[PDB]
Design a protein around this ligand. Structure first.
Ligand SMILES: OCc1cn(Cc2ccc(C(F)(F)F)cc2C(F)(F)F)c(=S)[nH]1
Length: 252
């Protein structure tokens, strides 16, 4: 488990190193993007980009996909009733479907899905997907500052391969996942994605924003990871949006 903290595997792809240190400011981390048309990677801070961290709520993407694949939820019914437990956000204190649960990052919805997934299925999936260290640990909220870790570079590779390769996941599941992840749509683009935020002893420790953008001309998968400064998911999102705008990926 010595180089289970690091993704070592070489890129046999065209890649361009970027300098986005200005946009990151006093935050430390990395940015990775992949263009379907160029079949190429663009990386800021390749060293940080290969260090593995807890995915936090970004892993809800995969819990959603597994739920759909095992028919725990589906396109007829993805609704789950509140357990009449008071959370500090009223968006959580009610019935959810996949869309509301993903949009509002409702932990209990995804936990209930995880509870119905046999560990052996999860281990098969993480292996086939090449998901980070594939370490399920205790198999209790293992994605939330626990045993499972994944690098920024791997977040892009694994998500792009899951969505874009012909694998055992159905088109219909990918479409429903996609719908739950949609954040912004205008005449120029559709922006999909999911934040994650780790907190350790009341401080932000681990910030993510993982997603993809469809334009008229291309499709880009991307992820920002923050390891220091104000490393929150919201900050990772803002930084992501700045970088994509600058690169011409977002207009309007
Ligand atoms: O890993 C934890 C984590 C979850 N999120 C998203 C999150 C968390 C809480 C709420 C809400 F409770 F306020 F609703 C909404 C969302 C979001 F809408 F952004 F998805 C981030 S950022 N980090």
């Amino acid at each position: 488990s010595i180089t289970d903290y690091n993704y070592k595997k070489p890129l046999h792809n065209d890649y361009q190193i970027l300098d986005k240190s200005k946009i990151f400011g006093s935050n430390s981390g990395s940015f990775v993007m992949y263009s379907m048309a160029a079949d190429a990677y663009y990386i800021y801070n390749e060293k940080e980009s290969r260090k593995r961290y807890s995915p936090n709520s970004t892993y809800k993407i995969y819990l959603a996909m597994f739920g759909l694949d095992r028919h725990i939820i589906n396109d007829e019914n993805s609704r789950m009733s509140w357990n009449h437990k008071h959370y500090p956000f009223d968006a959580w204190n009610k019935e959810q479907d996949l869309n509301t649960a993903m949009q509002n990052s409702v932990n209990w919805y995804f936990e209930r899905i995880s509870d119905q997934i046999p560990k052996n299925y999860t281990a098969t999936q993480l292996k086939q997907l090449n998901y980070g260290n594939k370490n399920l640990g205790s198999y209790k909220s293992y994605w939330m500052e626990d045993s499972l870790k994944i690098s920024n570079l791997e977040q892009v590779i694994v998500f792009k391969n899951m969505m874009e390769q012909n694998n055992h996941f159905s088109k219909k599941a990918k479409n429903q996942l996609s719908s739950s992840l949609l954040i912004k749509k205008n005449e120029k683009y559709e922006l999909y994605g999911k934040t994650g935020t780790g907190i350790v002893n009341g401080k932000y420790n681990n910030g993510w924003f993982v997603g993809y953008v469809i334009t008229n001309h291309d499709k880009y998968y991307f992820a920002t990871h923050l390891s220091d400064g104000k490393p929150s998911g919201k900050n990772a999102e803002l930084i992501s949006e700045k970088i994509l705008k600058e690169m011409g990926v977002l207009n309007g």
